[model samples]
Target chain A: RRGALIVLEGVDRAGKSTQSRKLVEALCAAGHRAELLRFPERSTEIGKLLSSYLQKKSDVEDHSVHLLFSANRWEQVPLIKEKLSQGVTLVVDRYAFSGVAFTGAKENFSLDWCKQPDVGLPKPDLVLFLQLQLADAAKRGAFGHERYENGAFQERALRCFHQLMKDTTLNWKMVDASKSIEAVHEDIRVLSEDAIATATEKPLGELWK
Target chain B: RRGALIVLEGVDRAGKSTQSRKLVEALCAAGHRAELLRFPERSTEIGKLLSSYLQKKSDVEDHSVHLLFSANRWEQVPLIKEKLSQGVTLVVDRYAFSGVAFTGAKENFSLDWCKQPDVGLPKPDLVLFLQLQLADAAKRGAFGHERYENGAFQERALRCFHQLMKDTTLNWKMVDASKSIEAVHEDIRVLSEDAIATATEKPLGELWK
Candidate 1:
């Protein structure tokens, strides 16, 4: 049987990386073969461009930047699909949600435009959105010295996520990131188990239609 | 008046690169500022992945690879648009057509799916498809040491081109690539002049709806 594809989502500094790592560890503890992947995967050439765009090292037009972010994910789809088919679960740090949120933040590029290039790519079995208020996120401390880590953008991103959530058809589980790390981990663990069970019982679906 | 956005397109060995370079030179020689651009530009990170996929160093799922190719182009759209806006006539060696042809060649992805991500991208003022027959292109030594350059794939790509052409709303000029180099260059020169005049004389229009 094929394994489930899990995606963790949130605005900048929502503790997605930490939670995603925990979820993967939890799955492995339960004896499932699970691995973690992050978007703006700065490892690839496309990812480097995305990273540069995010870091402000290079200026990119909004419409073009949005598509590059989507393309960054597309490049990794085949590997994720192969692992899933071979009975390995993938714990994605972020996927289409970030693509939609970041791109959708700008006007003129409709949600449909942001969602188009992503159609027919591997669909996540479960998407976990690490929800948090901007106020709460700021108190977490040790902010990375990066372009998109500021408070104002995070506020805007929160608004963007609301619109993005409405545009997707993936099964989403919103976890409160304001809680303690262990509590958030527990919430994700339970939700992830249920999502995997449900997805494993059904056939695969496309990401964006 | 701003120079026109001209795109050169065709199957491999149809002399797209050669013609595009010559055209750029000719445009410049004629006192027009022109630049030549290619898709799957192996220079960027995304292009590098696409290059790996094409060179058989990496094997990607067909649907994913197609989107990556489109994404590679997306990364370039801003620069392309900026240059065009500044009256720099852009000469794209390949654009959305290659995205459609290559993806559609695989039969794993539909034409509609292949074209989705590219919606709202910068529209070309003129697309010059270097038309060549399968037999003629074969004789011109078309196949490269890469994937998707075979006779069968090239034939499929031609069919895809026809289908895609029906969907294009932009001014498309099919140039006879089977002609002598001198003759082909002359034909393209006239077409470029005509396209520039048409663009300057007409109101603006979008590329893909």
Candidate 2:
């Protein structure tokens, strides 16, 4: 059986990180091979540059930063393909959608321009977007994670995410991230059961091809 | 008078550096404010990463490196615009053309894909292409710079460069790089005289618009 590449995308404070972890745990407990990953992956050389830009440790132009984010993903293409070929289901926190939405938000950049570099990248077998309202996210700050600086930007990114989903061919499901941890995990798990099966049988796809 | 952005593009060891410097000096002696610049400008944080990749000190994927090169240029956009606005003629050694050609030559990447990341960049006022035959460049042997491993690659890049110049709106002049240094310098000097004047009066164009 083949493995699938699944992605969870949302604004900051969304439960992507937590749900990705829980989904991986559930799959492993069910005797399936699964692992979790996150973007702006600060492990490789490209990752370091992205880390600097994201942390405000360095001043980077928007276009350059956008391309750098795309580059970060491109650097991992072979590894991602390798892991999937080895039958290891891969769950990602965010992918090209975040890159396009975030950068395409503030600037005059169109989604087309933002998505160009990532055109031929591996398409996700399933994309689960964890949608959380800003007000709810602020209220759900149990871990003391309320940063108001990104308030306006997050709204713009969500709009961009909606625009990116016009792809009729892509398999996408929206999850109410305002739900409880256990409840959200159940929603994600039920969805993943079907995702893994379809992805295993379906051929891998090219992004925005 | 407005300053122009003049670019000298060619394969490795194609005398872009030597002639760019000479043209700047010639313009200065003729009572013009001129400066020289080069790509892979290995000084900033992005530049440092590009330097490591080029020197074989670190491993980088081809698409990542291509975006890095584009980022290196984007990092300097404000500076480039400022100098040109301040009536400083920039005799750049290379620009987006080299980025597209070198990367596109080796891979299955079409010129369109290679050119996308660099789209909307500040276009050159005049492009001076120093055309040197691979045989002539191999024979020149100045500064003991004969690295034959890049032979086939350079030839492929030349074809890519030729393909890149099909833009009807661009002002391009091909120079015989096999000529004497003084003669080639003279060729560049004369062409730049016209370029600086035209760019002074014309609006700066956008790349691949």
Candidate 3:
């Protein structure tokens, strides 16, 4: 009974937060152990830097901000692995792809550069990309207080996600955000069920190629 | 007419240091604007951490050490891009892959954990991997002053290198390092000639997947 690593990835307002919560609840209701983790964790030393940068209380160079974001994830890496090993199903809200796609959207830096740091992080067994149309996301709410929560950044991040998927070996699928909340939840439940069934018996292999 | 970015990579005693110097000298002799840059750069603020770690003067955690190494590179990224844009051939002694592969061998954490911090640094236009048999590297003075300079780490690092090529797009070529210094230099020279010719005309691309 190896644990499964599930990831929910997408732009802000793409319903990732809601879907992740529902998925966790659904998994628990089915009598499985489950947990959720987010990136830019804002809980560790490195995360402090990310928090400051997001709050605009401190100026962060693009490269520095990118590293901090990834570093925040690294801080929780051992815990993530340990929980999975202990047979707790781990549902990651972002994982490395968020770090890559979000920063890869920057102008001077290329998507490859964004992905360079996360070359070896655990590959998710189930990467459910909650895709939403940019216009729709904007309508849900304007950019948040964070640096990368804007329309432009979201567009670029979306492109980076496309490029990123081509470069790594994570099982990926997209859920249409245009669907109603319940419809999306049903889709998520169906995917999660299949993923859990498929990976429940499979040994965790190297996450990256 | 952007100059190409050439990287010389291999385990210790693979003679990458000597080859890097020779390659730069040859490029200059041939009237190309070539310069050499080494990783764990030791000159910048972030580099101090690497120097301290390597010299065994300070102990850094695995995640901290990984970020410092990448930060060391980030410090020089602009220069690398600028020089290349200005048509100056840049020969780096080592680059991101070495950082990813070498530390990945340590296995203090998951290999994916080691790779996450380096997601978006500059990618080399070409990587010359000086392939040497482990036995040969031992004969060439395997253990240096660094933590990973010994045989065991070198063995693991070698395995990481093989894995790296499969995951990167950098034009990678393996040169037999068991040859005499002169022969190895010749092989490197031929590979450099081809890479330089190809990359000199092409602009730099994104760094990661």
Candidate 4:
């Protein structure tokens, strides 16, 4: 049986990385073969370009950068599928949700447009959204380090993320990210374990069908 | 008063470049301020990457390259708008239609997905589709020199083009490209003049608005 594909999504400084890491550790301790992955892998050629744009070392058109983010995920599909087939649960740091949400937050970009390039990509078995109040998120350490870490953009992106969650049919679990890290992790741990234990034996699905 | 934004579209060797140049010349000779433009404008940084992908000098993912093509156009949006507003008629060699049709012809790419990045762009005042038989197009010159120059792909792209024309509300005119050069030019010249005359009276529109 294939393993579950779990994704973590949230605004910047919402502790997604921290929670995802703990979730992976907890899943392994609970006897699942789990691995962690991050989008905008930031190491490959495409990712390198994306990194430059994100770091403000270079500028890319909004649409072009959006596609770069999608392509970063596309390059991982084969490996993601192979790992799942090998019974290794893949814990993804970010996924198509962030790609659509972040880019759609930009002026003049439509949600429909932002979501198109991601169609046919492997769908997540479970998506854990860390919901944080914009004010609380802004108070988190190391804010405004990257290009998209601004308050206004994050607020707009949060709105888009809400819309995406409403529109998506995936197994979505919302965690209050403003809670203590341990408490948030506990919620994520329970939901992730349940999702992994009850994952369907059906073949992996595609994004947006 | 603003000038018309006219776009010429067709499969390879359909004389889009030749006709666009002639149209610009004719418009100028008739005492109209006109300029010629092409998509995949290979001068800008994004365009240089797109050109490399098209020439097989570099490899990019299908979705990435598709958005890069769209980004190439997006980078020109300001200039395109500025020129039209300055009353300089713009005769474009290709536009969003070719971007959609060519990319959509590829495997696993939906036509709707291909058109998403181009939403809300400046709508053309007129789109002249130069219809040519595949045999005739092939007979005209060398083929298979670039990524999308094959007959099979052209046929698929042609189908996509037809669908786009049917779906769009833009002012579209089908010109038989098999006619003699002068005859084709005459038809385009007359239609173009009429489009220019009427366009200045209307507000500039956006794609898919």
Among all candidates shown, the one with the greatest lDDT: 4
lDDT of 4 at B198: 86
> Arrange candidates by TM-score, highest first: which order?
2, 4, 1, 3
Q: What lDDT does each candidate get?
A: 0.79, 0.87, 0.78, 0.88
| Candidate 1 ranges beyond 4 A from true positions | A31-33, A52-65, B28-35, B40-53, B57-64, B203-205
Q: Which portions of model 4 miss their true places by more than 4 Å?
A: A25-31, A179-183
lDDT of 3 by residue, B62-157 (tens): 775687677667767788889988888888888887888877887565566566556556667788889888887888754678777777787888
The residue pairs found clashing in candidate 1 are: A45-B45, A46-B45, A46-B46, A117-B117
What is the TM-score of each predicted model, taking all chains together? 0.87, 0.95, 0.61, 0.90
Enumerate the chain B TM-scores of all models: 0.94, 0.95, 0.94, 0.98
DockQ for all candidate structures vs. native: 0.43, 0.85, 0.20, 0.38
- Backbone clashes in candidate 1 total 4
Give a tens-digit lDDT track for model 2, residues A1-209. Answer: 77899999988778899899999999999988999888978898778877776666776788888898999999999889898889999999999999998888876898888989998888899999998888787676543323223677778888999998887778989999989999999999989989998766977888988
Superposition error at B111 for model 2 (Å): 1.4
Rank order by DockQ, top first?
2, 1, 4, 3
The parts of candidate 3 lying over 4 Å away from their true place are A165-169, B1-64, B76-209
| lDDT by residue for model 1 (A47-94), tens | 777777777888765765676777678778778878888888888888
lDDT of 4 by residue, A144-200 (tens): 668988888988999999998886568788888888999999999988888777864
Q: What is candidate 2's lDDT per residue for B1-209, written digit by digit as tens? A: 57999999988778999999899999999999999999979998788988777777777878888999998899889888899989999989889999999888876788888999999988899999998888888786642333223777888888999998998677889999989999999999999999898656987778888
Q: How is the predicted docking of candidate 4 categorized under the CAPRI scheme?
A: acceptable
